[PDB]
Amino acid sequence: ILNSLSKELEKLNQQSEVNSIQIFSDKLEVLKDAPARLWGFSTLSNAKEGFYN
Amino acid sequence: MDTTRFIRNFILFKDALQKQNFNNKDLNTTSMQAALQSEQLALSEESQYLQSE
Amino acid sequence: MDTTRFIRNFILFKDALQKQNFNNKDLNTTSMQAALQSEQLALSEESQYLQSE
């Protein structure tokens, strides 16, 4: 059971990620001229974090 | 308010209150007031659905 | 209030309440009151969207 719990912990250790960014946006629906403010989040140390079209 | 949900609710309230039984100004006014109340309810719907998720 | 969202909501409420069925003063007044209520609702929308993000 100790060996199985160690294998469980090592299987859990691979999915523990670092450095993942995340985008967010209210109002997924939008009109022709409505703003729909996009907000991004980068967990990098220093970056430029632009938006590309 | 959210704009497109307001437009769809305004259209649906103008379909429910059919315009043959309604003067046009009072029809548009009652549909607008009911759509604004529907937006005020849908805010709490968004909060409750986030909590339930 | 936020100014540009108020202008867009005022324009949209003057499009929904079409001016052929409305005296101009009452149209502008009802659109202004509905836009102010929409700003009061959009404050709570901003708070709930920040919490959900």
SS class of chain A:
alpha+beta
Shape of chain A: elongated
Whole-Å distance between the termini of chain A?
52 Å
- Largest interface, chains and sizes: B-C, 17 and 19 residues
Rg of chain A, Å, rounded: 19 Å
* Main sheet overview of chain A: 2 strands, antiparallel
The percentage helix of chain A is: 10-25%
Extended strand count of chain A: 2
| Physical arrangement of strands within the biggest beta sheet of chain A | 1-2
Question: Helix count of chain A, per DSSP?
Answer: 1
Tell me the series of helices and strands of chain A, N- to C-terminal. HEE
Which oligomerization state do the chains in this entry correspond to? part of a larger assembly
Please report which band the strand proportion of chain A falls in: under 5%, 5-15%, 15-25%, 25-35%, 35-45% or over 45%. Answer: 15-25%
Keywords (chains B, C): Coiled coil
